Amino acid sequence: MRCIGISNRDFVEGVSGGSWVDIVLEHGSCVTTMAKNKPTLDFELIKTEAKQPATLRKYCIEAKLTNTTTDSRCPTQGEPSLNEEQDKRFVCKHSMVDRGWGNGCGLFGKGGIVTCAMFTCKKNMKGKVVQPENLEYTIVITPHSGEEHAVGNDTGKHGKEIKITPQSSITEAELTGYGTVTMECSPRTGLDFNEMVLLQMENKAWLVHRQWFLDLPLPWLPGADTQGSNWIQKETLVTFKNPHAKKQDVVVLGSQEGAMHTALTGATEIQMSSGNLLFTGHLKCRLRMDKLQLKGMSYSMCTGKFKVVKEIAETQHGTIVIRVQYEGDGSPCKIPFEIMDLEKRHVLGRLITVNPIVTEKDSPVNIEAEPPFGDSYIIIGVEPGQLKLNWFKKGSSIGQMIETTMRGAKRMAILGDTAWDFGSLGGVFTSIGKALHQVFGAIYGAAFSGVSWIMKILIGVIITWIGMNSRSTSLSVSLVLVGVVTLYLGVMVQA
Amino acid sequence: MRCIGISNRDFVEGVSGGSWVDIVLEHGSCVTTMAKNKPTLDFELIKTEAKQPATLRKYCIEAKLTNTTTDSRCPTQGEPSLNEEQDKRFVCKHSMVDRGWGNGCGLFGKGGIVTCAMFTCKKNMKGKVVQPENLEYTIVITPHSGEEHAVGNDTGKHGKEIKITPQSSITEAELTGYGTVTMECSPRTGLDFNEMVLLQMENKAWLVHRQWFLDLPLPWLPGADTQGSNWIQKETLVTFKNPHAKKQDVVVLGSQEGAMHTALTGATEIQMSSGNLLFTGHLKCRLRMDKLQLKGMSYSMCTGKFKVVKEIAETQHGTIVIRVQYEGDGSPCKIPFEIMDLEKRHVLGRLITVNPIVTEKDSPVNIEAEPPFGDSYIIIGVEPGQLKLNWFKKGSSIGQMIETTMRGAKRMAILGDTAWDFGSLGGVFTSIGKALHQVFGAIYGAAFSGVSWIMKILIGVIITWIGMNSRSTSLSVSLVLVGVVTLYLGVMVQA
Amino acid sequence: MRCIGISNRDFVEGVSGGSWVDIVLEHGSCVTTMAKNKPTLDFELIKTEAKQPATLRKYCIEAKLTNTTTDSRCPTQGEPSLNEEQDKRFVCKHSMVDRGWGNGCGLFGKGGIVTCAMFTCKKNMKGKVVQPENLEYTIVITPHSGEEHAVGNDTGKHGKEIKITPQSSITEAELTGYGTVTMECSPRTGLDFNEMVLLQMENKAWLVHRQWFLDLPLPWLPGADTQGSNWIQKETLVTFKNPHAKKQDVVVLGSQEGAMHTALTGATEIQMSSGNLLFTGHLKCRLRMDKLQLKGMSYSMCTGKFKVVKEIAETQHGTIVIRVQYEGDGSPCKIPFEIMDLEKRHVLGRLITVNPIVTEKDSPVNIEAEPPFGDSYIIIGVEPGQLKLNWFKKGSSIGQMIETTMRGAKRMAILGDTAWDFGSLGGVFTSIGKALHQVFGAIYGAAFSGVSWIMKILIGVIITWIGMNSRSTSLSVSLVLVGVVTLYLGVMVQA
Amino acid sequence: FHLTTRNGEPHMIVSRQEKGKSLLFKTEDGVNMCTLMAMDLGELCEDTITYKCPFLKQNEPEDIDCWCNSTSTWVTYGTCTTTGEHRREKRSVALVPHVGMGLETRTETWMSSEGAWKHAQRIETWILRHPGFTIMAAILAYTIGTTHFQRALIFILLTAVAPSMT
Amino acid sequence: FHLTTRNGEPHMIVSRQEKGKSLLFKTEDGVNMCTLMAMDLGELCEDTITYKCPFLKQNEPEDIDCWCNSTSTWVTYGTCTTTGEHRREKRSVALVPHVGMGLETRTETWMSSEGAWKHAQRIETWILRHPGFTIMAAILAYTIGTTHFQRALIFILLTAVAPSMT
Amino acid sequence: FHLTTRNGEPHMIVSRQEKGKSLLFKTEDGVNMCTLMAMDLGELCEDTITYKCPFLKQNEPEDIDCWCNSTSTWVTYGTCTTTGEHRREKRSVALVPHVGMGLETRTETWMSSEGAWKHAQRIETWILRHPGFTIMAAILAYTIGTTHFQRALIFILLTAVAPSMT
């Protein structure tokens, strides 16, 4: 009851044999969890954080040149040997020039020169590498209880926010009034954060790739060292000119701050100051929701008169959301709510908030539902005081069928290898039932009669029997597979 | 009639009821329009001009220069910066030269020198682009009144000049003494304009492909600028003598007008002195001669003396142009005008200026006419004083037949796709009729008996029946097509 | 025995029709010649040189300029001509320069200039072409006697070095003890030589291509030319600055010797001290052996004891070295060296040095052997106290089969068409036997019994009889061919 | 030889009035004895060439235009001739256009010899430049064609129609 | 003008307070007349540059900024500009950070998924970027190939080669 | 100097011992003072440059080194630097060598025509350069193709495909 308005609405409407339900979570892509006799939920990752960064490497953006000594020897005397060459504090080189009888030496020949200078590092340019185990995932969990101050909200707090640390796999998030749900939710099986790096300057920062981050022909200092003397990639900034005699116009290039800032412009700027808001990364979230329970589910069917305050406004996914008030008495009380045909014979739609509850007098109550495309009558209450609400929604049924089926197929594909339980014996049939649900359950529950499970499994065994004794083996394979799918997923959907 | 000596004299031998003749017109090519018992017209374009052309990019041609300076520093001091070089108004370069130990700074080595000057230049091109909108055509319309100053005269005050443009669609024009003609024209057929550009130099102009401007290495000015201070590729004109220690004198390239004239030769020269004669594209001009009156068909018959001043000035088409004076009284009157055979049995000529009429005594009249092929007699006047002129035309019958049908074929070729009225339902039949006329009607009216139409359509239906009831299908397809063309084109010719 | 560590080695074992080995000799390769009743020899090349080279064209690199003259005449006054021009020793140019009325002359216009100067040149190249005739080849012959300096020694007294030149083809060389051996060959079967030319400067040299050697744009001199008067393309070294007034400041181009060191480097370098390294091109050579016998054979076998100094060394060709030391008494003596198989019965391994001898006791002999890849016993000495040193030799017998057969095949293939003596009638049999014995001879010698020739030719005629009277004609062609090869090649091997 | 200062350095403007002669002055630095050894110094112009005469104390001058034994200084002068002109004329820059098309028009017409034979000449030029396509068309004609007349007609049609597409 | 002893040799520290004046002093080595002649000198700051000043025998001063004529000595001084700022040049080095990505991501699910999608998009582009070849190849295969396997080979191979060919 | 009669005219040899000053001498016409504005003057040596000094009466000396007031002459001088050596500068160009004769590649490429013919040339180069794959493709075509034209078709398709995949 928190994610009514965001574009990436998703629904998972299946359960496992051991109630080990599996979800994917992405930035901005909330999820709604349905279940039978159990409270429904809404899951989202609200903010991604990367705490305790690892200082990968450091760059000296600007340079200072000091204590620049230099010496030379006449030809055949060998290179001069000062004490700065051994010390890495000084960056330096040797070369040769023609010297001889003209300029002091004996004969014209290529005598050696050594040219050394202290390299002082005025300013730093920090690099941060995020490892998979350093992702602190902030997850918001909100029930479909009946709250009001979460619809189209960000801080709306009736549920709980939990910081998942991948070192701690199992975690207990105590949802108020309903108990707790076990959190076994890993980012490890998501995309690998192996090639993302953050450049940090003063307080601002950008995001850029690792290979690019290291390719830069700049001063190159390791994370472990602190003094900076152990200095690598010497010749990036000190550009010695051609040595005439002994001196050469040793000068460090100007500050690269402006140049590299101009170059880095256009990359992914990150306002790191409010945290490492990484915009990518799957979270693969396995949950035992059996510990969770609905304190409100079994309250008495609710008798008194019942009225509506605000009228419907459509949502992005196209779901009924009604704020309704209860003028009667008997609170707390289980409120009737059904979505009937216009002749009040057979039920069409589905309601998200299983067993809606009204445990407070003179308060709005949020009721959620999802009809099909077609005229329908939301029937509320019991006579005296019956409420009938005509409703219609646009679209094509096949549109939702293909949309939901393809969305679930992609969800299972990403929630695939290493994710769905294939190694766990006994639950293998349950795991394949879950998978077949996540792909074909839209077709099963919507297209194929809704359904009354007993009679449709009878039809399922009928189609299996016709398939096995068919005039063609191709049709036999094509039809008995669907029939066994129907039977097994009817045994499943019953749960 | 104006057009004598112009090689490309196209003909329209006939008119229909709709009279929606779409004349082709091209540079250096006149057109003659016939019409049964209606005034006969001569069409020309006298002058193509694109008024108010746009300016694309100016090019420099003759470079003044001043404030040239050479600054330099000793090696190991960095090439000096100048207040001169930071402004685009100047042109400049940095270079490296071996300053020796005697050369001011006694430390021999290779160092930087900055050399540069002001660059404002005197004579400049005018580059210009022409769009389809700005195409203005100047159309000359003349009647065949046979006024004396017609042979080899273009702008003489005898006809009408109209300022046609695609921006304009309809405009009536007045032909003095012959009524009204509507310029409902359609200048649609611009050849191509993306890759053609106009160039002007003081008092001369040229046409050249756009790539030639885009690639020619000379100084630039985009059309927007007006100060003449910002230039692109400005370094090409300046060519620097080899650096000489601290001297670095700059020189440019001198008079390029001669280089332009000798190199650009072979491109399309345009005589802008008389305006810009754009020899490009054809004109596809629809004219309706429904409301064009003829003054003199009702006049009496000439009965006086008859005399010839000058004999035929033989034309490229062998068309008799008789400049003849009628001292006889009674004017205005209709002229006897026969073109007869050797034996003088039957007439087979084709006079051009319908209703040859003398407006006033003691005045010459230029009668235009096209005799048959071979030898023949021209009969002017009536006995007594009957005037006979023997004349021979060298052309061959089937020859001139095939070339005139080919001229019609070309005219329909350019007057082809999107031109002939295919959209107008009901008028599609008339459009195909006029097409068959403009191609095969020469054959129809000059070879097939002339013709008295009733008996020839009888013969045509006979031919069609024989072709349909023939022994071979190829001959049937060959002959029934000719028959149906004969029938329908005859029905058109009657109108 | 200087081929240890030399990768390319062939164990040619045989004598040709005229009892002359056909050496294939390549730089950095080995040859070893064997035959029964014939001491083994080692044939090598150690030095290649070209003497009395021809000077294709002399290049003088550094040009000094003297006695430069310049003169000019005003326009229309004339074109000056100087006697200095007629003498070709000067480089001369004509030119055009503006003069003027106020410019120290009479009128505005282009007057002529002639400027020219002497062209001396001090430093010069030396480019020479080498003909096949002028080459000299340093062959060296070594005996397999096992002497201490006769193993892997580049300066041992044992070896004898001879030079080979076409001018003295039939030459006689002497080997200590063994006697007289004949030098005779024309090695011109190698790569073409006309495509290469050698430059030399002071001491360094470069191998380059003739057309490149002539392309380099500098002054020339024909080969016979030595006077310095004639000079071709002498303009490039003498740069004439821009035409200017009455002057043409003549600039002398700098020595390109540094430029040549910059360019030629990367190409094929050569040092004259080591002689030309024209390793390209095989050297085929004839070499008669009839005039040599076994030296030391008269020495009796000694029945003392044998000791081993160094362990069983391994070379790069499946061959074993044994330093056998004789602690007993009775030196010198004919070495008993033999092979046995696991059954201690058959002599299967192949020996290198026939009848080795000991110079003196306590001076061991370096016996060399080639057993087959497998397990065998090198029997040193004779019982009692024999030494049946076991030895496992890695590899596959088919390995050496394919390797030796292929190497001999390629050896006779590069020396194939127009190389092996097919024209000689009667000697065609000897040439066919030569081809088989160079290619198939290892089949007779190594794998087929070792061999004692009489018994195996009996076996071969038996195999021919079996193959002829066989059940299959394919097997007949496969077996009788091998049998006749065995018989005829054994007859050849006896020679 | 009018003297001013720019960038904190002296700046003398010389003219023909003092040409090819030793420049002399008395300034704060001392007795300034400059030699203007230059070349193009004529009467004053608007092509204002400028120069640094460098400070040279005693050494051997070389590869300089002007020098002064007292201190570095600026000198300037013109370059135009006596009569008056920009500078010496040269001829340079490489350039040439395409060559035209006019009074011919670009459609098959007029029965002319050149126009009539242009199409055949282009066909045979294409055939010479495209032997492989010619062989391929011949093979297709052979396979599809049942009669030799149809074979030749189809081959000619293919060879004539393939270039017209381009 | 401040003399120290480093590496067994004298070291001379000079400031701009004695700029443009010959190095004159007196020590036990003798009358050490010496000269500094380059104009790179700046004020006294931390950017210390050094030299060795060679010893005259007969030659004219040449090839060295400094020149002594009594005993070789090392001269060092400051080079920073008058505003107290180190020397520096405006030249800059960097690259283009917009787009780079060669090979990444997990090992297998990425392999399967991106293989399916890349093959799908590649084939689909070949089928829509060049459609007519596809349908003509399909009908040609269906007409010519004897077996469905053969027909599959025919049109799959044609659809593979034609868009690359065209 | 040495006023000799060279080529039948007066001829002088001016050296560097006097420089940048007007010479004075005597001839039959009288006393002649000679200007010498040659800036690239050195001391006398072998490299003797020579002039034919003009005669000017009153016109402005322009674009010339030498001139007098009475008569023409021939002034010469050396150009050796202080060390006494000839003129000096670098560089020129020599073509970089390499091993093996390269004669298989000349002329530059027309983009459109060579792009069009890239496939035709590439198939030929590839089919020539890999006879082994030619044999395998031929064998596969021989086996698969039931009748002759199927065999040829499969062969040519594979030969066209093989370069493309590379």
Numbering used by the authors:
A (entry chain C), B (entry chain A), C (entry chain B): 1 to 495
D (entry chain D), E (entry chain F), F (entry chain E): 1 to 166
Anything the authors wrote about it?
Cleavage of prM to M and loss of the pr fragment converts the VLPs from immature to mature particles, mimicking a similar maturation of authentic virions. The icosahedrally symmetric, immature particles contain 180 envelope (E) subunits associated with the same number of membrane-protein precursor (prM) subunits and internal, core (C) protein subunits. We describe here the cryo-EM structure of immature, small VLPs (smVLPs) from dengue virus type 2 and show that they have octahedral rather than icosahedral symmetry.
Focused classification and refinement of a symmetry-expanded particle image stack yielded an improved map of the asymmetric unit (three prM-E heterodimers) at 4.3 Å resolution. The asymmetric unit of the octahedral particle is an asymmetric trimer of prM-E heterodimers, just as it is on icosahedral immature virions; the full, octahedrally symmetric particle thus has 24 such asymmetric trimers or 72 prM-E heterodimers in all. We obtained an AlphaFold 2 structure from the DENV2 prM-E sequence, docked three models of the prM-E heterodimer independently into the three subunits of the asymmetric unit, and manually modeled the linker sequence between pr and M. The model was fit to the locally focused map by domain-wise rigid-body fitting, structure morphing, and real space refinement. The stem and transmembrane segments of E and prM were reasonably well defined in the map, in particular for two of the three protomers. Moreover, this contact is essentially the same as the twofold contact between M proteins in the mature icosahedral particle.
